[PDB]
Amino acid sequence: EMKTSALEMSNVDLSRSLTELIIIQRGYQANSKTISTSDQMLQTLIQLKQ
Amino acid sequence: TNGKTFAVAKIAMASVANNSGLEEIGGNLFKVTANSGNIVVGEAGTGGRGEMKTSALEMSNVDLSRSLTELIIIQRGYQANSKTISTSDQMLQTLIQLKQ
Amino acid sequence: EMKTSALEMSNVDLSRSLTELIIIQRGYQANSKTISTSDQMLQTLIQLKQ
Amino acid sequence: MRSLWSGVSGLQAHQVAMDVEGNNISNVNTTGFKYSRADFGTMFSQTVKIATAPTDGRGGSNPLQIGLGVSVSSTTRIHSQGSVQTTDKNTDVAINGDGFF
Amino acid sequence: MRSLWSGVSGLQAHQVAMDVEGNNISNVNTTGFKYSRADFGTMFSQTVKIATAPTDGRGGSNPLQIGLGVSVSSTTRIHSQGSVQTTDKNTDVAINGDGFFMVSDDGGLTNYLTRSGDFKLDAYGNFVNNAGFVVQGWNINWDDQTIDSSR
Amino acid sequence: MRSLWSGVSGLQAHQVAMDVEGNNISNVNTTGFKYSRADFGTMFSQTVKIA
């Protein structure tokens, strides 16, 4: 049914959102490490020949 | 200044059978070309073309992480081929020095 | 019309300004990376001959 | 080489935007001020090859242009009405709509 | 000798990719921009020998081609929708889906398409974007007080 | 080389999750809004040998 003279707000809970802002960030940081070490091994390869 | 507020003009838009087939120019301009299509003029929202959004401006679609990582990829591949050429040179100087 | 005995302040909103101070900075940083990698490829070129 | 030029291009462009922004923030509080903003547009692109219509059992092909650099097209001033404050001096009017002294 | 040519080939190829990438990063923030990307494809391979079917008590044999070099097949533009920001100028629309604005330096004989929209009036009546061109569309007829879209 | 590709993969994945989350937080208070969430799944694995 309709509910008159009243307005329906968003269902977004906020704590759930902020914690995910942490999670995403840390995982992002980690993969960012993977790529870096992967680069350094490459520069060791290319410098191996000199 | 009178009470009235008439609409004074109207803006057309258009669409092509193939985006990205069409060629770029300087400025933010694009240009019709072969492997693109004809302009197909129409109104603001009826041909399957989207509506205007007033008082707002549309930023570039460039994601940045995707770009930076490619700056790494390109560089490392470049470095490697740079090694290939070098060893290929050294074998040549060994050849020419072989006769002495 | 005139409005007497009152003075009209600047229209500058401030949040809009500060956020742009962030945007400009980060884009600046990025292009600054482009130039750097572009230099390193050049020094690899000149060192290629030795 | 090419990427170096485009890269320095974007760099000075962002410099120019920073200057205007620096002015806007620099004179908050000054009466009657109207802030401006920088605008960007792409530089002309080199076209290595032309697009082609389908022919002998082949499909069409996209144009192969590179695209090099970015530059400032224009600044724009903006004239929205500002906030008002009262003073104690009778002789200091502020217009409430449009038009200038 | 051979490896030298293939090697310089890959080198200029990566150069070409670097240029396009350099452009993409170079004009972040410019309105209405759509980024592109480079694409690679192998060069024709020399075939020193032909593959053969099994015969007199022998098995088959693989073709013996070398394969030399790499080169750029094509760039591609990409047209995903960009992020929006509001402004304080009423006359600066941004389309929300597909299709482009038309402009022309003339009476409209040579249209150009754009997704940018920094439209603004001049001292004169013409309704102009940044640097010159007058946006296409159509005007009202005062006798009828009506727009006439069909033409 | 291989780990580099997988590594950039996870990176853009987390980027995509961040965008959706950014939207959800961005429009709190808007009436009638219903939030969304991203979901992940592994890419096909190379099998060097058989059991």
Residue numbers in the entry:
A (entry chain A), C (entry chain A): 802 to 851
B (entry chain A): 752 to 851
D (entry chain A): 1 to 101
E (entry chain A): 1 to 151
F (entry chain A): 1 to 51
Provide the publication's sentences verbatim.
The assembly of about a 100 copies of a single protein, FlgE, makes the bacterial flagellar hook. The hook functions like a universal joint. It transmits the torque, produced by the motor located in the cell membrane, to the filament that acts like a propeller. Intriguingly, the C. jejuni hook protein, FlgEcj, has one of the longest amino acid sequences compared with other bacterial FlgE proteins.
We solved the structure of the hook of a fliK null mutant strain derived from C. jejuni strain 81116 (NCTC 11828) by electron cryo-microscopy, using single-particle averaging methods with image segment classification followed by systematic symmetry exploration. The final combined reconstruction yielded a map at 3.5 Å resolution that was used to build the model of FlgE. The diameter of the hook is 280 Å, which is substantially wider than the hook of S. enterica that is 180 Å wide. In the hook, this central channel is made by the C-terminal α-helices from different protofilaments. The L-shaped stretch (L-stretch) [Gly32-Gln81] in domain D0 of FlgE is the segment of the hook structure that has the most contacts between the different FlgE molecules making the hook.
